[PDB]
Every structure is written in C-alpha cells, then in structure tokens.
C-alpha cells in the first residue's frame, strides 16, 4: 500500500507509515538488485558502462537520502523511531493552524505545502535542543 | 502545540530521476538478438500492482514532462550502442557505376531501383573484386555531370551496417522508476494533456509502450476509448504540434511486393557486406492500403473535435504537407526491419464546411540519418522474401497552417515533429515524484 | 575468529555476535580499500573500467544489505541492539519444538533451516507490534 | 564556526559544537549532488567520461562507507544516536597518566589524539565486550 | 517469545563477485605481468584459516559459480591486456612462400615456411618488401591450380591482434577474495569425490592461491591429493561427462623449443612494431617434450586402479590416443616460455590393462602455433611474437582429463581417452575445495524474556 | 575514578590523500561553452565561498609531498586525451611531403622557418586523390635522405589527432575543491618558505582558483607573492632541484604573432576536415616576446638581493641561458591564442652581479625571439602527439610573469660565480607554485577521552 494513504487526512495516514517507511531502501533496492542479476546476459549490460554507472549513481543517490534523513533525525535525537515528539514549542508564525483540522479533514500534501518555508527554523531549533539535552544527560550522570 | 517528526510522510515532490528498462515475455520469445529484450533484461512484476489514490488530485504536464527526454536518450543510446560493434561499410563510398533496371519493372519504378556495381576490397588488401548490387535512387547521387555515382552519406559521415541478426522490432517497454520515486498515472477521461486531474493512481513501473518510431502518424500506440481527444501546448500558437488520438484504431495494410534476393559478400577479415542481390518476380513499388471509409469516418470525428476547440461556425481544410526533407515531408516509418517513406497527400485532401481503399506510394530508403543527426548514417541490410505489416493508426501529428486567411478556412497538414511526440502519445498519463518521508506536525504532546 | 563457533550451539553464540557484525563493514571494506590504494593502482582501477564498476557494486551491494538490515531491526524497535527481546508471542506452528528447550544441542544453520519458513509472517508482526508501541508512547506523552 | 568550530583550539570547549562536525560528512556529499543537479548539461560530459564518473562515485561510496562504520562502531559500543556517550571500562593510566584538568583544558583535541593513539584499538576492543555484557545482563534482567 | 539476533552466523548459497589479490606483489617480474597488473589489491601476508568445529556442509563443483567467475575474468583480462597493442590487419596480403631446406632435420622438413610480402611501412606513399619465417600451422595455400601463394588462416574471416612483446603471461599464482558479507568455505576432506557432504569444513576470506594455467590435456602446476589418485566426473557412469584425475605425485615433463631463433623487428604504422621470425641460428630441430617414462607408468598404473574402484576388477582398461578434431583439442596444448605449444600425446595414453595380480623417457613431438585463437572464440586472434633464444620450461603434470567412450554391445572393456577442451575443468581442478557463501546475520528465536 | 567517553564530531584530522573535485566559476560555464576547463569542471562554486578562523593551530606543511599537484597533473592529463579522442585522425598526412621554400616578403630571420608544401590527400571517394598543398614550419618536417622530399615528425614515433578546432584550452579558475569528510588547510604566513610549520592557517573546502597555465621555463599567469621575493627548493643545496622563484611583482609580457595567417579546409574523408595552414596574407615576420627592459632588470636585481641570504652575503651571482636539450626544456614553451610559442630567452638572463646591480647593464624593451611549431608533443609524452590547427589572423597575449624556475649550475667545490639558469621545470612545478599553502586532511571525528562520569547501569 505505498502512497496507499496519500491522499487519507493527517493521522488517518499516521498508521502506515511503517509501509511508507519501508521501500525507500532495500524493498525497492534490494528487490531490484536481486531481479537485475536474475537472469543471465548480465554482460549484456555490465559491458555498457553508460548504462551502469547510471544505475550506480541512482543506488548511491537513494542510498545517500535516506543516510541524510537517519542523520537529520539522529542529530535532533530519537532516532529509529518512526514517530517521536520534541521538546521545541510550535510557534504561531507556523501557519497558526490551531485548528483540530492539523489531524483532521486535510491531507498530508496540503500540510507540506503549507509549511515549506518553515522547515529550517524547526530543524536548527531540533539540533539546538538535542545539544541542551544530551549537555544535561552528561552532566547529571557525572553528579 | 510541540512539534513532532514523523518520518514514513506520504508526500511527494516533482522531480527528475533515471527510469531503468523492463520487459515481459522475454523467457524464449524475444531471444532472437532483438534489441530491446537485450538491453530491457530486467524482468517486470508477473502480477503489477496499481495503488488508487482517493481523494488525490494532481497536476500534470505532458509538455514539460522528463520522462520523455529520459526515453529519447536512451533509445538514441541504445540504438547507437546497437551499431556500434557492428561492421563499418567506409569501402562502399568508393565510386559506384550504375545502369537502370528494365527488367520486367512497372511504369512507376523507372528509375527508382538502379543496378550498380564498384570495385572493393577482399580478404586479403592487395586483391579487389568488382561486385554488384542494386540501390534505391534516394541513397545513390550523380557527380560528374555521366552513369558514375555515389553513396548520399559519402560527403558527411561513415556508414556502420546494422548487423544482420539484430533485430529492431518494436516490444513492449516498462519504464520502473528507482527507490525514493514513484510513477503517478493520471486517470482523467478525456485528459487534454495539461493541468488538475483526479482518480490519480500510483505505480513502480508503467504500462507497455511500444517504442514505434513513426514522423507522421502515430502507429501501434494506445486508443483513447471515451471519444478523439486533441491535445497541443498552446491551440492558438501555430507554431505547437497538435497530437490527435482517436478512439478507433484506422488499418493499414503497407507491403513490398518484391521477392528480394540477398548476396553476401566479404569486404575484409572478418567484415561481411550485404547488397540487394537481385527480385526474382516482378517489380512493383511498396505501398500502403489504408481502409478508404474508416478514414472518413475518422476524419469525420476529428474534424467535430477541432470544430469544438476552434469553432463550428468556419471551414475546416487538410492539405497535404509542405517541402522539405523525406523525414518530415512523407509518413517514414519501419516496417519488418525495412524502411519505409510514405506519401500521404492521399489522406490529407479534403474539406469539412459543414470496399473502397486508399492506395499511399511508398519508396524504400536504406542508407538513413536516424532521428535528424548528421555525423552518423545506417545502413540498413536488405530483407529476404516479401515484406508486409499490418498496422493500426491510432493517433496523428497536425500543424495549422499558419496564415489567418481572414479567420475563414483552418487548414491542418501533416507536417509530423519532432519524435518526442510520439512518445508524449503514451507517455501523458504519467509522472515521476520523488518521495519526501520526513515532515513536521503540531501535537498535544512533548518529549520528556 | 570469524564464523567461529558456527556450529557449537544456538546458545553459546555470546560475542560471536558481534565478531559477525563488525565483519560486515568494520575492516572489511575499508582496510580493504587502503589495502587496494596502497600500491597506487588507482589508474588500473579507473583503466579496465568493467573492473571498477564490478567493484563498484560489490561496495554498494553491502552496503546496501547491512542498510537492509539496519532498517528491519529500526523497524522492529532493536537499532543499536546486537540482542533484543520483542512482545510478539511465538507460535508452535513456526516450530513445535518444545519437549526440550532450544539451544540446548541446537546449532545454527540447522534450526536456521527449521525456522526458514513463516519467516514474512514473522516480520509483519514485529512491524505491527512496533507501530502499536509508537502509537501507544505518542498517545501517553501529556495524557 | 564554520566547518571546524574552533578545531584545535581546546579540549573542553571544542565538544561545545560538535553537530556541525557530525553533519558534514553527508552535507557535503548532498550539497555536492545538489550543486550537481542544479546545473544541467554538466551530467552528459562527465558521464561520457568514464573515468571521472567512476573517481567521484568510489569518492562517494567511500564517504557512505566511512560515515556506516562510524555509526557501526559507535552501535556496537551501546552509543547509536548520541555524540557524547559514557561508557563502564576504567580509564587506563598507562593510556595516559593526566587528570582532568590537564588534558580538557591546557590541550588541543590534535594533540590528545596524537597523545594516545598507540593504544587506540584497544580501547575500542574493551568497549566492544563491555557492550555484549550488558546485553546480556539485560535478558537476565528480562528473564525475573 | 520472539528474539531478533543480529550477528547470528547463518549461511545461503548464493553467487557474486569475488576479487583478486597478488601473492606479495613482488616486483621481480615486472614487465607489466599480466597477472601482477591486474589483482592489484596485496593479499594476506598470513592469511587466518578458521576451522569449523561439528560443521558437515555441503559442495557442488559442478554447480560452482567460482568456475564461470574466473573463467569470465580471465577472458575479459586477456582481452584488456591484447586490446592496446598493434593491429596486424595490414599484415593479411599475399604471401609469396618458399620451404625451409637450410640446415633443418628430417622432421621439420615442411613445417617452416620463408614468406616474403608488401607491407605499407611508416608513410602511406612507401611498400617495404620483407620477410618472415612462418609454421604451417599458420599458414594456407591459395590459388593451388598454379616460390606460391599463401595466406595467414586469420585472413579467412577473422581480425588478428599482436601481443604487446613487453607484457609477460607467466602464471603467477592469484587468490580470490570474496567482497564484505561473504566468506568462502573450504572443504579439506582428503577424500572428497566432487560433489556431496563433506566434513572438516573451515572457512577463509582468500583462496589459498591459483595458478592460471592454461592446458587443454594435461592439467600443470596444480595441487596434489593426498589419498592415492582423485576421480571426479560427477557420477561417472554417463561416458559423454569429461573426468577430471587429480594425481598423487607429481610426474615431470621437460618441453623445450631447442631452436636458436632470432627476433626481427618491422615498422608498419607510425609507433606500431611487427616481430618477424627471423633466420634460425643453427640446427632446427623438432619441439618436443621429454616425460618421466617408468614414472608415468606408474602414474597411469594408480590412475588404471583407481577407475577399477568404479568399474570393477574384471574389465579391461584400454587407454588409446585421442579421437580428431580441431589441433586445440586433439594435442596437449599449453604456454612455455611465452610460446605457444601443441604437443601430440598418443605417445602416452597406449596401453591395455588387465592385470591378474589383483633413466627412459618418453618423448611428445610439438608443433609451434603462432596465431592463436583462444577459447575456441572465432572472429578474433592474437598472434604470439616470437620469442629468440633456446626456450625450455619443466613442469609438473599434477592430473589429466579422460573421456570414456560407450559400452558397445558387451560392455567389456572401458576405453578411456584424453578430453578436455573447455579451459573451466582446468579451473575446476583447483576450486572443487571451495564454496561461496553469503552470510544473512539477522534469525529469530524464542526465549523466556519478553520486552517491557 | 576516570571512565571512558567516545566522543563523535570531534575536531581531528589526519594527513590522507584523496580524490579532490574540480568546479569553475558560473560565470565560466555561463560563456566559453566550447571551453574544455568550463566542459569538464562545469560544477559551479559557492559564489561566495567562507573561510575558517585561525584558531590558534599551527600546523605542518610539505610542497614538495603535496599530493594536489599529482592529482591536478593526472586530471589535466586525462582531461586533453579525451578531449582530443573524438576529433579526426590525421594518419593520411603521413606522406611523401614535397616542399619548397615560401620566398614572400620574408625577413631575413625567417628565411626557411616557412615551407610550401604539397601532397596527394585521400577524398572522401577512397580511390579518388586530390592533390593539395600547405605551410608549415621547419620544425614540423624533417628530410628525407638528400622541390625536396619530407615527413612529418610525428610519423616516425605515432600517430598524430588534430585538434578540434572550436575547443578553447584558456585558462580558467579552477578552485580545487575537497570532497566530503574531507577539508584543506591553507596557510597563510607571509614568507612561507615550505617544508614547514605555519602559524596563520586557516581551512576551506575550495582553493582560491588557480589556472591551469603552461609554461615551461617561466610562469605566465598566476598569484603574486605577499613581499619581496621568495625563494623555494625541496634543497637549495642539492645542485639538482627548481628554485621556484615567485615575485611581489608582476612583469609585463608583450607575446605575439604578427603574420596575418589564414585557415584552408580539406575534406580528410566522410565528416573528416583538415585544417591547413593557408597563403598569410601579406609580409611575413618571427613571433615575438617583449619584456620591459626596465622592470625585467628590477625584478632580477630583487631576486639577486633575496637569492643571496640563502648563499654567501658577498657571493657573485650569474645568469646564464639555458643549457641544451631539447627544445621543450631549452626554450620558454607556452600557449598564446590556440597557438604554441617557443621563445629563446637568451634575451633575458645573460647577466652577472657583484655589488647589487647589473654589471653588464645600464621606456627601452627586451626582444626574445619565438619559433612557433605546430606538431606539439606535450606534457613529455612519446606517443600521442598533437596537431594544433592554425589560428586565423594575428596573434596577441598580454601575459605576467609571477614567478621563474631556476636551476643551479654545481659547477666545482669552490663557489666563484655560482650560477643560475633557466630550470627545464616539470609541469609539476608549474602547479606547485599555486597548489603550495594547501593540505588536504581527512576528518577523523571519532575520539575518546577519560571524564569523572560513568554510565549509569
Ligand atoms: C504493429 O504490430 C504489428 C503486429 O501486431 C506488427 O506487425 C508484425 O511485425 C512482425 C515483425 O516483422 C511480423 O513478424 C514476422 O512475420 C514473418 C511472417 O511469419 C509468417 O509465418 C510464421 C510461421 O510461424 C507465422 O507465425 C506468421 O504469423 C506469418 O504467417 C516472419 O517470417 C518474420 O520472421 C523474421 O524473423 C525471424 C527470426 O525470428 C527470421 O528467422 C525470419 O527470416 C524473418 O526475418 C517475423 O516473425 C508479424 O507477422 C507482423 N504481424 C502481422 C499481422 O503481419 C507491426 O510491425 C507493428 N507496427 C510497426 C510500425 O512496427
Ligand atoms: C594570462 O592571462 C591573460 C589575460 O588574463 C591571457 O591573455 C588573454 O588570452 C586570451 C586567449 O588567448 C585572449 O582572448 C582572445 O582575444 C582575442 C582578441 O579579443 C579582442 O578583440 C575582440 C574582438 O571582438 C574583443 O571582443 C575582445 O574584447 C578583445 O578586445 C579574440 O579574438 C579571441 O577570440 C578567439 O577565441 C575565442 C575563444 O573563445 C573564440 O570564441 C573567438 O571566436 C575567437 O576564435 C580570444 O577571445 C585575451 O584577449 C587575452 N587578454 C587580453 C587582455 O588581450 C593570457 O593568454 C594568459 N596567459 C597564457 C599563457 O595563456
Ligand atoms: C604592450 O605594448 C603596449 C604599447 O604598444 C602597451 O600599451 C601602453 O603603453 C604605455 C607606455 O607608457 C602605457 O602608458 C599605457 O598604459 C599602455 N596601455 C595599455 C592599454 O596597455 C602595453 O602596456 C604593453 N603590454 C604589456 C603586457 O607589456
Ligand atoms: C674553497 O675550497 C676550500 C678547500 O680547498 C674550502 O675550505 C677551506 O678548507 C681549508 C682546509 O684546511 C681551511 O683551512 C679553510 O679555512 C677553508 N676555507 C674556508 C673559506 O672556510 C673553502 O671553503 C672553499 N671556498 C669557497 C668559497 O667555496
Ligand atoms: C563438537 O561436538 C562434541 C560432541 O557433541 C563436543 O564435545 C564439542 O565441544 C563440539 N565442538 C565445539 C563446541 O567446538
Ligand atoms: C560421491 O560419493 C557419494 C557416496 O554416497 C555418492 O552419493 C555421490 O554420487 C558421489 N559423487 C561423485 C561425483 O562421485
Ligand atoms: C630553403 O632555402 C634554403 C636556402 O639555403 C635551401 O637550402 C633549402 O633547401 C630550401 N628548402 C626547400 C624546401 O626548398
Ligand atoms: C611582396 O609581395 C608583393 C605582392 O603582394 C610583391 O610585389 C613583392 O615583390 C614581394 N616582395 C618580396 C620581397 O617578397
Ligand atoms: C635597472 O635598469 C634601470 C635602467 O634605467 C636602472 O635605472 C636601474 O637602476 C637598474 N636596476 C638595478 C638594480 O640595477
């Protein structure tokens, strides 16, 4: 059910995202790796070089995305874990949608396109807290 | 409100990627050296899977779409790859002394198939062989004024022979997108190329597309089944092609009713030359029948879909096309590994103010400059036996002719394009985004 | 001491475990490739280019399975854990052997064999019974 | 600031900022792509030239695999997703016979290093086993 | 209940792309070898073979994808290495050719050739006319109806390459390591048949150390068994499998192209050299080779032996010379001293057994082919340069290939004759020890602790 | 007690050695399309690239084992073969060339520099021959034996690639830039000699942009030095190293061709043209090189003044011309235009100094001559060579100097007149007069380190 619940309202689509989450690595590039050397005539293709290195840098580029989005969420703490609050406030600025109808009645899309020019502001204001925190855990395991 | 990262996000952003090849049925049946089961070895999903997305409405854009231009590249690249080791035919350029062929030969051919011969080289260097051969007219050119001649592509780049085993016949074609994108397929009836669309569904790889390379009707494509659909970037704008698909596919029946004869000749160690050897029968030229009231019937429906983009209160023209090369002016096309060059003045000769068969001329060209480039030319072998291809028109390329005639008559000719817009004909349904997992939210709920 | 002890028994893998898991990056693709720049053979790299592109996908193929990896143990609620313990309760029909307790005799590579199937099954409930989890911790922050 | 928040400048001070050090090593592969892709007509040239394709892609997947067995190494030490991680091994005086005081003031990060780098490799060893202890401490603990 | 385990040391059968490494990267060769340019990678100084204790695995040599790896990586080194060097196509004109007579034995009467022929030498304008000395085996007559006209055989349909003269194709020894995430096991049973279980099972990173060696007949410079003489032809009852005979001891074989020969270098293009034979100095005498008499005897004594193991005692054990064909397969062929042998071995494999008891040499004549076309891949060949001087090379004939011809209507006696022609036996000789394996360290199990 | 910590991000690095990225300015790429450096290092910069602070750090560094120069070398290497590998082949020029003297308003110095030539060409008809005819200079063509018969140079050792002719080899920006995990320490002390500690230094991920100039026996575009003149030997006193002479100040360069030249095309074979030198229009006149007499005899007194703090304070100094050799290393070679100047700088040097000033010397201008060849085997190489096409018109650059190479003549045990000549430098030492002040350094940032905290259990 990859993008099964796309165009699902926010929340509603929070229960898939383990499928989402799965199939940027491995189910698409594992499988595809496994199904490109199936079959034989392997040479067919690995003497084209063109072609290879094409592939090469696809592989490397998805690999090196999803590297950056395990980085991103180890860096502002609570990595492997798909869902996982903060402690950084939401301010109005953002949209002010305090509405109910965050988690109702509009689809992830839309929430996206809302808040495009706010993304970095939240991402250093992360890395900022995951510094004070993990400044916090060493000094209180040393008292 | 705190903020939340969730990771696993179904957005999406539109993007550019490497699509990668894939075919089916390529077990046993396309094991003939053809080119596409070669190059497309990945096998596709024995059950593809399509995702509909509800509530999902997105906007496309066939015109800008990339897909395209990843698919031109790599069909240049791998017909180029295709070539390449294949033998080179820089010895034929020598000069070629020619007479006419009178033998039993139509009163339409005469001239068109000339029975040439030259010196050329052998196995070993110091030894040559004067051979024979027949060439069509449009690959052979008089100098020196009086019977010598020469090879067109002499004077502007080497001719590689495509090896006689490769086979470029058209098969289906799955286009798979990478890890991190996906394929949306729109699913808008009566989709007018541009613009919102719902009923949207996602796929990892698309449907099959025969890669039919045609420059003035679109052949062997897909039918738009609610009703004819004219698709252009811009109506008002002249300048923009304007690809029509219909909901019935029309039949043409195109042949070569030739008994070819093929010799085999070494021009070196290890180089083997093929030449049209002889036409055991009689000669009669290559031509095309396309059912007479289907057509009109066609012509009918297109004529009352560009009355509704244009208006029903003017005359509406077909004119056959304008000068310029073969490539543009006449319906090239390949048919059973021959070449075909058709005039279509027989079609697009009418007017709409308010058993029968049309039979189109068709010549036979070998020595070609593939998708309009100048520093290659291939030569295509000659092909034993009789040649015919039966062949469904679904969709045509129009240009409006560009004067105003005072906004009385519009008259639509098939000037062909660019060879993008074919595939544009299969490929405006589709369109590649790539996935953006990671997003924020607001919540009730803080770490502790 | 790699692969040692692969047939002693399931329960004295111990440290073996890790002694498998660095083997799959650590050393093993970088001392390898300061072993293969050292002799300055770069150039018969780059030149013989099928060479480098074989290579080349060696590289990235395992780096691609140890991703894999990675991700299914993120998955499942165990990244960074060479042994975690989970909630899913484990079924006779996987494997009815319980008149005596495994790792007793048992070795690996055989009782692999036994548990090669249901395996899928086993890995959709480690996902699920992870989402829930997430799900739960999400709800009871500020609950 | 920068790329290096004040590198060599003090032991103590210098672990104040250290995100931006963790970040590079795939800001930089991704900001390179990105000022790859913003420019096109380049990928054609230097894709036909087979050479500097291979070079910059073995240049990436060695960066990919440098930063995988950093995070490898510091999983198997117990420490996934955290830049500063206490451990349970003893320092060793024989590594180093300084106090606190001596080495995270008065000392640049570069000489720290080079101060104790023959005995590396054993440090990481002892944290390896420390690790598997605990784990398995921790299935006894499961096992009450 | 449920335990994920990562790290666990669990095991698939599975097939990928190993990688090469020179034994010590020694740089007493030079010479651009072959064999040291490529597996640039320095192997193990003190590789660390692990034992398995309580581990009965299986192998398959016959299903080893090892085989087709090195098979497919030799053929695409040799081409690389051939690939940049001169292009002999102006070479293939016609030869006008006279019989060697000048102080030649009775057996080489014919077999060299003086040919003279055109070449286009240095500018476009100039035809140098030069000389060469050619072995027959190259060389073809043309135009038979009317000193006479000939041809070299690649001229019929096939572009011919020379062999750069400064790259050497000695077969240094090479171990294959598998990439991160595999391993490679090996097998030790002294006993082991070729296919099934086998015990003493360990595992390395790196293959103990091949030599390339290309022999069609004999297989050279390989490895011994220990257990008497080693028989593996799958199940040998179907007589259409070859059978590969690895042997307990070695036996000595001394090749020799006795000739004082001299190289003659020609310019064709602006850089591109041609290496002519030049005028032999002294005698010329037949290529041959001189094998160990009373200890082939004994050899082939084991060998009769051993295949009475599996066809029984009461049978006849005929060895007879092989069966026609093309020279690459129906000779010894092999690579001494940078040349190029074929050598007739009927002298060998002539003998009856039906034994009831249940200082000599033996000298192989030789032909010298130049042209040469490798893995029976027509459309290309490389002609191997002469190479002056006296070449000797003595080496050790560790096992052999025999095909089994049908039973007839009786079945009462086994003839046996030598096979081989696919180079992958060869390989098989020294990879029927290991197996790759693909390491999947993430199991389940269950356990008394359960998560909190 | 003291417990371990591992911790990541920590500021270390180590001297390594890597794959550096090359990337031109965006206004580079945006024209100069049919350039080969804006081609291949099409990858714009930052346009405005950040420096590091100094941080108190000294840090060691070595010109002479500076990886970058290898690593520059190797890339322009392989960036002119594949940029000449598509263009025409010229093996059919390899014939019989039958020449004459020119005899058209030729000064008395180019009397035979220029030769009429002509030849049987192919067509593109291969049983067709057209016979042509073209100019080239002496130093192309060689006899044969013996209007008069000749060949080609590059015909007795390899084939010979034309250039294609709207490629553009000028120099451009270049910024050599670091991968990532990777960094470059610049130093910036005034005076750095190198093989050294520096004090002042700063990291980057991106050089300051250095063009990739060739010339061999003087630089010609480059950075000035900071004051006064620097002096840089791997060992002044090996008597067999470059001295690598770089000046506060530049001096100025006239360079031209002055012959109105003109291109004649031939049709080689299918798509294949020859680009012939044709008929020059007008009178004829050697290539010249004009120094300001003034400045030059300025900057070589400062260069006397530097070099003697490294010798005796009252030692004689000497410049001498060059030795013989070949005519790569005897002669000031460089790229002007598309075309190739070899010019004698016998001109320059030439010279002794015992107090100070010129002993020989004292708005006024030093002429060098400059033959122009060609057929150009670059780079020392013995295959591959070459073929530029002529360049229509007349030919000026406007060039600097911004640094010499020097060699040191040993001469005896007794130092009377230690002389310098101009040092046949290798190409490396071209770009090691630019590529010094920079270290590539990989990042190492794991570490560990004792603390008074231990992990809670
Ligand atoms: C649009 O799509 C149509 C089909 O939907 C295409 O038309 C087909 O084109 C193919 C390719 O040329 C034709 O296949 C050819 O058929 C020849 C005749 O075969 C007869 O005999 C066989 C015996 O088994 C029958 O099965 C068959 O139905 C016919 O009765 C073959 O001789 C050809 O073989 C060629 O290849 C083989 C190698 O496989 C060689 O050994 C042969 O010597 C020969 O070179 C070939 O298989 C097919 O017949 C066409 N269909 C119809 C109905 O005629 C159009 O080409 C396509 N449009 C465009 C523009 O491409
Ligand atoms: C050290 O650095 C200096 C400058 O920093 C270099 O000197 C420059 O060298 C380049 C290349 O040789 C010169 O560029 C050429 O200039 C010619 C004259 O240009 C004048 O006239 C035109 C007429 O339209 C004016 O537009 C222009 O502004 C000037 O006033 C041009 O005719 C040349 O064009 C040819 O080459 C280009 C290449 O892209 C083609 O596109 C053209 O069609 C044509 O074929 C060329 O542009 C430049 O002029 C020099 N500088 C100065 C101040 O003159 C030194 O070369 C460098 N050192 C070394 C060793 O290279
Ligand atoms: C090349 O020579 C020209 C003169 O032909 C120089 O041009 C001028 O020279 C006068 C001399 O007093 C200066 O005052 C001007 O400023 C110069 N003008 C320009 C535009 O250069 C020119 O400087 C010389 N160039 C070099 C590099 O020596
Ligand atoms: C000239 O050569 C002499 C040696 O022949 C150099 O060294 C002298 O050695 C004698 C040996 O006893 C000493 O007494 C002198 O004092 C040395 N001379 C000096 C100047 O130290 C001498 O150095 C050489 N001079 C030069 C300028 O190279
Ligand atoms: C192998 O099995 C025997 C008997 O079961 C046992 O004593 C021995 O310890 C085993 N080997 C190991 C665990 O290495
Ligand atoms: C090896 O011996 C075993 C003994 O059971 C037999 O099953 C197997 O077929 C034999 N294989 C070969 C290749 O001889
Ligand atoms: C050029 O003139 C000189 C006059 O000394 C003469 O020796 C030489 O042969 C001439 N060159 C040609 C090619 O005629
Ligand atoms: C120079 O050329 C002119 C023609 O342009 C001619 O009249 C004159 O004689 C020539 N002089 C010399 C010295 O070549
Ligand atoms: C250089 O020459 C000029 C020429 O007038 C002279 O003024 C100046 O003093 C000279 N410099 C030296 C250092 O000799």
Redesign the interface.
Known sequence: ????????T?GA??????????????????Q??N??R??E?????????????????????????????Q????????????????????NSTWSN??LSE??DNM???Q??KE?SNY?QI?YG???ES??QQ??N??DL??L | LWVTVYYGVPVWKDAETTLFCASDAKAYETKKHNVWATHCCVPTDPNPQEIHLENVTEEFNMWKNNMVEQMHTDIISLWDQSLKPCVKLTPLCVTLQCTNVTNNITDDMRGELKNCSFNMTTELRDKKQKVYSLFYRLDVVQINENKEYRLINCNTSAITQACPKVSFEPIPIHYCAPAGFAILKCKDKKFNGTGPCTNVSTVQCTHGIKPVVSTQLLLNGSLAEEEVIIRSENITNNAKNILVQLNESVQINCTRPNNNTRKSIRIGPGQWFYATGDIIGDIRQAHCNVSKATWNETLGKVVKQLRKHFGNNTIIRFANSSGGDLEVTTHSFNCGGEFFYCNTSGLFNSTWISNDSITLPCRIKQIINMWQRIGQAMYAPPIQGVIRCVSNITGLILTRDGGSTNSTTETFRPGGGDMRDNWRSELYKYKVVKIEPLGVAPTRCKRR
């Open positions: 059910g990859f993008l099964g619940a796309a165009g699902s926010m689509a929070s229960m898939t995202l383990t499928v989402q989450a799965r199939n940027l690595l491995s189910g698409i590039v594992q595809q790796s199904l490109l199936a079959p005539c392997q040479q067919h293709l690995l003497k084209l070089t063109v072609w290879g290195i094409k592939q090469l840098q696809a592989r490397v580029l998805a690999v090196e995305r999803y590297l950056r989005d980085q991103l969420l180890g860096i502002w703490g609570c990595s492997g874990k798909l869902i996982c609050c903060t402690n950084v406030p939401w949608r305090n965050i988690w689809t992830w899309l929430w996206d808040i993304t939240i204001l992360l890395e995951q510094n993990e400044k855990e060493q395991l040393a």
